């Protein structure tokens, strides 16, 4: 009766910034006011569940994993579910190079 509306879903909870060292697996989770699908984007691009990407939803909550985090991957991801969408900067902290120092004790 009153305020009778239904259809599109809005992201009640915006994902949190993403941070993981190179060669890691990011995880973007969010929540919706109502059971609805989503489209995990990236640097202005649409992503899809596959080998590297893993999108999992549980009713109103969503999830997206990124296997193979690299310097390039470092970008901005947005989860769209209709008219609105979220965003969480993903920083890929390059792993500490295992550079082997050589010290023959000469100088």
Swiss-Prot record:
What are the disulfide bonds? 30-79
Positions of the Ig-like domain: 8-91
- Which ranges does the record mark as transmembrane? none
Where is the protein situated, by its record's location annotation?
Cytoplasm, Myofibril, Sarcomere, M line; Cytoplasm, Myofibril, Sarcomere, Z line; Cell membrane, Sarcolemma; Nucleus
Reproduce the UniProt comment on modification after translation.
Autophosphorylated by protein kinase domains 1 and 2.
Q: How does it assemble?
A: Interacts (via protein kinase domain 2) with CDH2 and (via protein kinase domain 1) with ATP1B1. Isoform 3 interacts with TTN/titin and calmodulin. Isoform 3 interacts with ANK1 isoform Mu17/ank1.5.
Q: Related disease?
A: Rhabdomyolysis 1: An autosomal recessive disorder characterized by severe and recurrent rhabdomyolysis, usually with onset in the teenage years. Some of the episodes may be triggered by exercise or heat; others occur spontaneously. Rhabdomyolysis is the rapid breakdown of damaged or injured skeletal myofibres and may require intensive care management. Muscle breakdown results in release of myofibrillar content into the extracellular space and circulation, resulting in hyperCKemia (hyperCK) and myoglobinuria.
What is the recorded function of this protein according to its Swiss-Prot or TrEMBL entry? Answer: Structural component of striated muscles which plays a role in myofibrillogenesis. Probably involved in the assembly of myosin into sarcomeric A bands in striated muscle. Has serine/threonine protein kinase activity and phosphorylates N-cadherin CDH2 and sodium/potassium-transporting ATPase subunit ATP1B1.
The record's family statement is:
Belongs to the protein kinase superfamily. CAMK Ser/Thr protein kinase family.
Q: What is this protein called?
A: Obscurin
Q: Which organism is it from?
A: Homo sapiens (Human)
